[PDB]
Amino acid sequence: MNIVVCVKQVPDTAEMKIDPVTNNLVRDGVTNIMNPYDQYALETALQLKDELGAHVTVITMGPPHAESVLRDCLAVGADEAKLVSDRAFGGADTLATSAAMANTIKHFGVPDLILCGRQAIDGDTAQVGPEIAEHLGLPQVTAALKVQVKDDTVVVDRDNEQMSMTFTMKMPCVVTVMRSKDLRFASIRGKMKARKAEIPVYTAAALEIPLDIIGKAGSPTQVMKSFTPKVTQVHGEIFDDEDPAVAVDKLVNKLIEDKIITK
Amino acid sequence: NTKGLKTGNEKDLWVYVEHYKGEPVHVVYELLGECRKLADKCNQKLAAVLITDDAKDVPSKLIARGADLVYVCQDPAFKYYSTDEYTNAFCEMIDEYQPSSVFIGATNDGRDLGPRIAARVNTGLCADCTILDAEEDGLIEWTRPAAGGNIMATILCKEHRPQMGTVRPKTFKAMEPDASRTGEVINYTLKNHVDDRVTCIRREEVVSEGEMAIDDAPFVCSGGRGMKAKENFSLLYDLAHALGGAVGGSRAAVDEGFIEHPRQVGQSGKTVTPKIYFACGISGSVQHKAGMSKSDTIVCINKDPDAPMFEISKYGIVGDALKILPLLTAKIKAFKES
Ligand SMILES: Cc1cc2nc3c(=O)[nH]c(=O)nc-3n(C[C@H](O)[C@H](O)[C@H](O)COP(=O)(O)OP(=O)(O)OC[C@H]3O[C@@H](n4cnc5c(N)ncnc54)[C@H](O)[C@@H]3O)c2cc1C
Ligand SMILES: Cc1cc2nc3c(=O)[nH]c(=O)nc-3n(C[C@H](O)[C@H](O)[C@H](O)COP(=O)(O)OP(=O)(O)OC[C@H]3O[C@@H](n4cnc5c(N)ncnc54)[C@H](O)[C@@H]3O)c2cc1C
Numbered sequence: 001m002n003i004v005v006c007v008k009q010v011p012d013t014a015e016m017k018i019d020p021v022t023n024n025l026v027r028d029g030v031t032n033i034m035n036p037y038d039q040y041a042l043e044t045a046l047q048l049k050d051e052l053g054a055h056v057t058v059i060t061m062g063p064p065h066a067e068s069v070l071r072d073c074l075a076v077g078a079d080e081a082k083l084v085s086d087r088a089f090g091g092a093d094t095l096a097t098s099a100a101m102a103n104t105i106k107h108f109g110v111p112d113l114i115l116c117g118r119q120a121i122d123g124d125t126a127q128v129g130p131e132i133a134e135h136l137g138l139p140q141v142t143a144a145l146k147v148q149v150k151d152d153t154v155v156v157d158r159d160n161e162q163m164s165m166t167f168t169m170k171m172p173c174v175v176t177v178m179r180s181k182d183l184r185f186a187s188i189r190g191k192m193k194a195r196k197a198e199i200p201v202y203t204a205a206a207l208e209i210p211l212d213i214i215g216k217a218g219s220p221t222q223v224m225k226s227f228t229p230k231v232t233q234v235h236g237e238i239f240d241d242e243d244p245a246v247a248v249d250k251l252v253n254k255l256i257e258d259k260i261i262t263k
Numbered sequence: 264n265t266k267g268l269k270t271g272n273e274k275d276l277w278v279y280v281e282h283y284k285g286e287p288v289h290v291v292y293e294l295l296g297e298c299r300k301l302a303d304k305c306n307q308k309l310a311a312v313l314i315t316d317d318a319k320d321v322p323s324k325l326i327a328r329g330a331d332l333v334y335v336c337q338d339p340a341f342k343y344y345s346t347d348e349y350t351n352a353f354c355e356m357i358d359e360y361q362p363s364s365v366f367i368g369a370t371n372d373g374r375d376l377g378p379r380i381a382a383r384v385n386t387g388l389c390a391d392c393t394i395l396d397a398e399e400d401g402l403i404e405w406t407r408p409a410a411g412g413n414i415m416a417t418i419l420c421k422e423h424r425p426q427m428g429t430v431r432p433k434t435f436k437a438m439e440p441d442a443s444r445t446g447e448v449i450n451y452t453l454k455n456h457v458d459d460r461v462t463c464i465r466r467e468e469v470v471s472e473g474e475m476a477i478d479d480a481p482f483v484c485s486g487g488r489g490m491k492a493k494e495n496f497s498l499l500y501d502l503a504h505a506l507g508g509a510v511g512g513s514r515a516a517v518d519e520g521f522i523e524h525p526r527q528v529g530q531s532g533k534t535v536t537p538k539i540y541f542a543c544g545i546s547g548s549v550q551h552k553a554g555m556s557k558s559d560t561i562v563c564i565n566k567d568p569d570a571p572m573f574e575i576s577k578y579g580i581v582g583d584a585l586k587i588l589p590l591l592t593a594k595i596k597a598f599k600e601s
């Protein structure tokens with residue numbers, strides 16, 4: 001079986017902090033990483049490779065420096081990597097990004113399974129995987145909690161707010177991944193074989209993707225403005241008495257007086 | 264090229280009727296309240312779109328909650344949400360009636376649905392929005408958190424139609440039902456049936472007979488890795504029972520086997536906005552805080568005075584949750600009696 005994992009390099013937005021005193025955005029420890037939900041998607045592909053012998057290709061639409069993410073993928077055992085890089089793809093919304101990715105995937109031949117993260121932690125739209133699936137006319141299951149393959153079918157656990165569910169579909173299909181075990185470790189050997197690999201770089205012209213469907217030109221939406229939201233500082237009343245019975249008395253009498261706990 | 268480009272003749276704001284046990288989920292009513300204001304701003308109608316096996320008396324409730332129009336597409340295949348069935352039915356109605364904008368609650372399934380529709384129609388979609396406005400001409404201004412809530416973006420879909428967004432639940436207020444409102448039910452017959460390519464082989468209710476779900480609980484009593492053992496969750500059940508609340512946990516709690524995934528709070532689980540969230544042995548990772556930071560009051564019980572969760576907690580105790588909980592629960596119970 002052939003698997004394509006769509007991976008995205010992102011700033012580590014989990015490291016961003018708005019200071020509630022200044023309302024300023026602090027970026028201490030923010031570096032570019034592999035999108036964590038993409039690390040789950042990749043680890044899932046790798047588990048299927050271990051189990052069944054699958055061929056795993058990772059593809060990203062990013063600037064040149066996004067190459068490092070592809071290297072990290074190869075370093076943990078992905079078979080092949082492709083970098084889709086051209087300023088013509090820049091400025092893309094999720095429609096334009098999915099159009100580029102869907103057309104890239106088709107060009108090389110649609111695999112048996114396409115895995116995406118549930119969302120990217122920068123945009124946080126959770127739109128690209130289902131949009132890819134629609135562009136390619138394939139069935140989807142979003143927000144996988146577990147993924148298995150049984151013959152020619154993919155078996156996916158997914159919840160909603162009321163129900164815990166399991167679905168099956170025939171390959172070729174698209175799954176977006178909410179969770180898997182943490183992506184496996186890349187050894188020194190792994191990283192060296194990755195460093196030596198050829199990673200082709202594809203322009204829009206090389207892939208014959210029309211310019212008007214990609215980048216800004218292919219984007220129905222446009223970000224008009226962005227801002228750091230205000231964060232109201234909370235001035236907590238925190239009791240740290242030795243005797244937990246004392247701390248609890250204080251806490252409860254305050255919750256009572258402040259109308260938090262009622263009769 | 265030109266797919267999805269505006270005709271200029273599009274009109275009305277549509278709200279997707281997500282339903283369970285036949286009945287709209289509350290985010291539907293939230294969106295009808297907000298979108299009622301937007302539709303009035305641009306002098307267009309507000310429509311609810313109901314794809315179901317059995318409309319029951321639901322169109323009446325949708326009208327009472329602000330809808331001028333209710334589009335109904337009924338078929339047995341629609342009993343449960345499915346990407347393939349609902350995307351088809353929703354897109355046939357967009358094609359037929361040509362709305363200006365569409366609004367989908369950013370629930371698990373809404374987040375599945377929205378991007379399928381947007382790509383099928385070839386239009387713009389803004390995700391999990393928290394602030395909405397409209398120009399007199401019907402152009403919707405979508406504002407949303409990005410980057411884990413660290414950046415807000417204000418976005419426009421200027422030329423493609425309908426202008427689409429998913430909208431964060433528990434953000435906007437519903438209107439009180441108004442028995443005196445009037446509206447029009449339009450029954451839409453499917454032109455082309457489809458086969459669902461996705462088969463459900465297991466569908467289990469996460470909440471038991473008459474028990475409380477975290478999703479809608481006025482109080483949430485939540486445990487992390489600092490609860491130490493699964494059996495110690497009984498402490499949280501005791502506190503929930505004293506309050507009339509529900510029990511939740513961190514992803515670490517799920518991983519340690521303390522709780523099942525449907526009680527997980529955070530960006531990969533549920534977002535809850537209870538009157539109180541008791542955070543017990545939970546550090547307050549950003550991924551957890553994503554799911555509970557809009558709780559009215561947060562009470563933190565944690566051994567580590569530098570736990571990030573204290574940062575956002577109006578009240579708390581530095582100490583051992585295993586000693587503090589049963590004293591807290593007793594004291595609350597005493598107050599509530601006789
Ligand atoms: C602040 C901000 C707000 C934005 N809001 C919107 C908006 O509401 N609507 C919108 O249409 N666009 C928005 N964008 C643009 C958007 O971030 C990009 O189009 C991005 O390429 C994809 O969407 P995302 O980051 O939400 O990823 P998601 O849709 O969350 O990504 C889902 C999955 O798709 C795959 N994928 C995403 N990007 C790539 C990539 N470049 N290469 C390979 N695979 C990938 C990965 O598997 C990923 O985990 C916004 C950008 C900014 C900076
Ligand atoms: C992509 C991604 C998505 C994620 N999604 C989510 C999600 O949806 N929800 C989620 O919760 N996390 C999520 N996480 C995980 C998150 O990063 C943390 O690992 C997790 O929230 C930590 O859970 P915790 O606070 O229970 O445990 P820890 O961080 O290990 O904290 C345990 C706490 O217990 C305290 N403690 C110890 N003993 C006691 C005692 N006797 N009494 C009181 N306190 C005590 C300690 O002081 C500490 O503060 C995600 C992470 C990634 C990377």
Ligand SMILES: [Cl-]
Pocket residue numbers: 134136137138139
């Ligand atoms: Cl399709």
